[PDB]
C-alpha cells in the first residue's frame, strides 16, 4: 500500500547504479537528460504506491555520489519493501498436493525482502520448486528436474548470465529452459516479476 515489490527495489537499484556510470563519464552535461530520465524513474517507482521519495532523490542527484554512499541510503529504503509471504506448510502441501514427500524449504536461508519468488531445491529428487504471488495475488506453485551439472549462460527468468541448468517441467513431452541453479542468486538479478510469469506460461 506504502510499500513496494521486492523486484521494484531490484530495478531502483540497478538505476541507481546506473547513475553511477553516468557520474564516473565525467560530463554531465553530455549526459543531463539521461541523469533526469534515471531519477524520474526511480521517483515513478515510488510515486506508483504514494511514498515519499523527494528526499533520497535529492540525496541521489549528486555527482559525487559513490557506492558507499548509495548502499546506505538504498538499505534505508529497505524498509519500504513489501515482504514476500511464504505459505504454511497446509498452504505448500496443497499448492503440490499430488507430491507425497515434499522437501520443504529452510526458513532460516531466506530473507523475505530479497526474493520475488521462492525457489528451492530437493537434490535426492533433482528437483526444484518455484513458489510465487500470481497477478490476482494468490500462491501459485510449480516444480521440475534440475541437473545439477551447471553451466554458465542467460537465465531465462532474470535474464542475467549465471550458473545455470536446465529446469524441466512435466507439462513425456517436457517443456522448459536454463535457469539460475540457485533462485537466491536469481531473485538479486530478477527486476520484473512478469519475466517469472512469462517463462511460467511458456513451459506449464
Ligand atoms: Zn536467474
Not at 499430488?98 to 535426492?124: A, M, Q
Not at 528436474?145 to 548470465?161: A, D, L, M, T, Y
Request: contains cysteine.
Amino acid at each position: 500500500m506504502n510499500k513496494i515489490e521486492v523486484y521494484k527495489f531490484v530495478k531502483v537499484k540497478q538505476l541507481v547504479y546506473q547513475l553511477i556510470k553516468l557520474y564516473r563519464t565525467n560530463d554531465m552535461n553530455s549526459h543531463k537528460t539521461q541523469k533526469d530520465f534515471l531519477l524520474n524513474e526511480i521517483n515513478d517507482i515510488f510515486k506508483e504506491k504514494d511514498i515519499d521519495i523527494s528526499d533520497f532523490i535529492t540525496s541521489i542527484d549528486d555527482v559525487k555520489l559513490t557506492k558507499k554512499k548509495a548502499e546506505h541510503l538504498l538499505n534505508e529504503l529497505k524498509v519500504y519493501i513489501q515482504d514476500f509471504e511464504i505459505p504454511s506448510s497446509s498452504q505448500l502441501e496443497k499448492i503440490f498436493r499430488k507430491v507425497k514427500k515434499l522437501k520443504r524449504p529452510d526458513i532460516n536461508l531466506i530473507d523475505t525482502k530479497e526474493i520475488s519468488y521462492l525457489g528451492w531445491n530437493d537434490n535426492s529428487s533433482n528437483r526444484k520448486y518455484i513458489v510465487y504471488k500470481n497477478l490476482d495475488d494468490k500462491f501459485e506453485g510449480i516444480y521440475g528436474e534440475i541437473s545439477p551439472n551447471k553451466v554458465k549462460g542467460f537465465c531465462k527468468i532474470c535474464n542475467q548470465e549465471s550458473d545455470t541448468s536446465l529446469f524441466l517441467n512435466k507439462t513425456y513431452t517436457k517443456k522448459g529452459d536454463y535457469i539460475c541453479y540457485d533462485s537466491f542468486k536469481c531473485n538479486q538479478n530478477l527486476d520484473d516479476i512478469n519475466n517469472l510469469y512469462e517463462f511460467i506460461v511458456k513451459i506449464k
